[PDB]
Amino acid sequence: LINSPSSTFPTLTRHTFVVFFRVMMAELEKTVKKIEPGTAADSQQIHEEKLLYWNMAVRDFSILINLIKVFDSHPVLHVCLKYGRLFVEAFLKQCMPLLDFSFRKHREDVLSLLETFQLDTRLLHHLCGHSKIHQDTRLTQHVPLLKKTLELLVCRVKAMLTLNNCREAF
């Protein structure tokens, strides 16, 4: 966007950014779904490296999703609406058990990871807003399960704090 009105990794024109964006978000979502949550018997080092692996995927997800605002079009919005909910569901299925194990020991890592994820959850709530406001049917049909995945995330944070005996702390 800044240099070429064609990049520093060519075959990256405004045409080809759709294809680059789609594969990057798909392969981030595929990287995150390969991560497994451990057991209490597993060492604290493997928990810490898994939490670093997770936070890396969530910051990559935020850096990719923040390219919604500057590239609002048909296929770019369809890509991140889809891989939005499909990365958040990957974050719910295979992180949240590891955060429930390692919360009373590694508390601020867990809360930081969830509140890192909430700052892009809010970008997807604004994106759900955008897909409804411009009554764009192609955008509005990935909304019900994008919103429902983020509502599962608020109630699953409540479940995390219930299971770690801070139930009034949500």
Please, could you describe this protein's structure?
With 170 residues, the chain is an all-alpha fold. 71% of the residues lie in helices and 0% in strands. The N and C termini lie far apart (41 Å). It is classed as ligase/dna. The entry lists the keywords Complex, ligase, LIGASE-DNA complex.
The major pleated sheet works out as: none
Calculate Rg over CA atoms: 17 Å
How many distinct helices? Answer: 7
Strand content: under 5%
Distance between the termini: 41 Å
Instruction: Kindly state the number of beta strands.
Output: 0
Give the class from helix and strand content and strand pairing.
mainly alpha
- Percent of residues in helices: over 70%
Task: Annotate the secondary structure layout.
Layout: H1 14-33, H2 44-65, H3 74-94, H4 96-101, H5 107-133, H6 137-140, H7 144-163
Helix pairs in contact: 1-2, 1-3, 2-3, 2-5, 3-5, 3-7, 5-7
In brief, what are we looking at here?
The modification Phosphoserine is found at residue 43. With 170 residues, the protein is mostly helical.
Descriptors:
mainly alpha, 7 helices, globular, Fanconi anemia group D2 protein, 170 residues, 1 chains, ligase/dna, 0% strand, Complex, ligase
